[PDB]
């Protein structure tokens, strides 16, 4: 149960805030959990997904497939992994939209800022 | 890529004026090329460069004028603080704080005291 008078439990307000979230806010909404391997290494449960993070699909029809995040389509609240695709009847190949909460990050794309974020969350880095 | 205003702020009045002209020339060239080609999106970068250079030019020229009126009573309305019409008409701190000698004396003789009940 909430205690703060600033926070709202209104469904309509929540849904509005989600569907009209600006790009920056959607970054945080599109977090994924680290793999249990990486959870040991960094000491962090989850991060905002990012292009070039490697991933494992852990729910749905493509459960078991791996790849790199090819695109974070924030507008669609989805991510596209290279190699997770739909072979179309004409022979073309379109990407499948996966939600990051159904992935697991198996390798982070690190850089000064990602490193700083991990240490900011009480992570380990090594 | 585009020009960057941190790089332009090192430059002089004359260098900036010169660059502004080189961009205006470049922009014209692309407006011609756009007629031949279907799509030509490089033109956006050079529009925004022009706008960047003019911003920096104007900043320099304004800060110069701010220095020219340093401390003087009365400066150009465009350099006076905006606030709101009603805020600019309000009494200043000084004006609002004025008390007559009669009231200043009472305020010293008989301030509200700090006290507590037991």
């Amino acid at each position: 149960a909430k205690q703060s008078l600033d926070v709202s439990s209104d469904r309509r307000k929540a849904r509005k805030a989600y569907f009209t979230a600006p790009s920056s806010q959607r970054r945080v909404l599109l977090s994924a959990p680290l793999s249990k391997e990486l959870r040991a290494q960094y000491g962090i449960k989850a991060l905002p997904i990012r292009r070039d993070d490697e991933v494992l699909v852990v729910r749905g029809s493509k459960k078991g497939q791996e790849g790199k995040i090819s695109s974070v389509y924030r507008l669609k609240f989805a991510v596209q992994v290279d190699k997770v695709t739909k072979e179309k009847v004409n022979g073309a190949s379109v990407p499948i939209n996966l939600h990051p909460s159904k992935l697991v990050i198996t390798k982070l794309h690190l850089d000064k800022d990602r490193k700083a974020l991990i240490q900011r969350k009480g992570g380990k880095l090594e | 890529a585009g020009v960057k205003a941190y790089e332009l702020r090192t430059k002089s009045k004359e260098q900036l004026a010169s660059q502004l002209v080189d961009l205006k020339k470049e922009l014209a060239e692309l407006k011609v090329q756009k007629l031949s080609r279907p799509s030509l999106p490089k033109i956006k970068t050079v529009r925004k460069s022009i706008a960047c250079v003019l911003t920096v030019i104007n900043e320099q020229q304004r800060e110069a004028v701010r220095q020219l009126y340093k401390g003087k009573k009365y400066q150009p309305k465009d350099l006076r603080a905006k606030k709101t019409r009603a805020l600019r008409r309000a009494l200043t701190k000084f004006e609002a704080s004025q008390v007559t000698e009669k009231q200043r004396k009472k305020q010293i003789a008989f301030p509200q005291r700090k006290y507590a009940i037991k």
Binding site: - | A86, R89, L91, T92, F94, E95, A96, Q98, V99, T100, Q103
Partner: protein
């Protein structure tokens, strides 16, 4: 008097309202005077006014005004009350002496209708107040 400004004296209603002559404006000639001066010098604030003269056709008044922009007034602790924007057009809202007379702003049993504001008093007395627990 104030002649009712209606074409050819036609009033278009019940007889109680057929009057055109013998009607009288609810503000004094003094208040009209302050108001018309106030509009001519809108940068100033009407402080007060006084009678000086009359003939059959006119009454004459002198109206005292203060400049709230003048630093002699803004820096004066006794007068800079008039610089605050609540006091804009005090003559137009009936807040000068003549105004308060005409609005019936006085204490006691003779001013039950008006002492607090006629319209406010009326509204308070014609409001149905309902509590949660009736």
């Amino acid at each position: 008097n104030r002649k009712r400004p209606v074409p050819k004296g036609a009033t278009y209603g019940k007889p109680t309202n057929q009057g055109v002559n013998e009607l009288k404006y609810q503000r004094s000639l003094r208040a009209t005077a302050e108001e018309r001066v106030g509009r001519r010098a809108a940068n100033l604030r009407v402080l007060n006014s006084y009678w000086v003269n009359q003939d059959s056709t006119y009454k004459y008044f002198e109206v005292i005004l203060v400049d709230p922009q003048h630093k002699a007034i803004r820096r004066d602790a006794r007068y800079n009350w008039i610089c605050d924007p609540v006091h804009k057009h005090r003559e137009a809202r009936g807040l000068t002496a003549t105004g308060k007379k005409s609005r019936g702003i006085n204490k006691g049993h003779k001013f039950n209708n008006t002492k607090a504001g006629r319209r406010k008093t009326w509204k308070r007395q014609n409001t149905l107040s309902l509590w949660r627990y009736r």
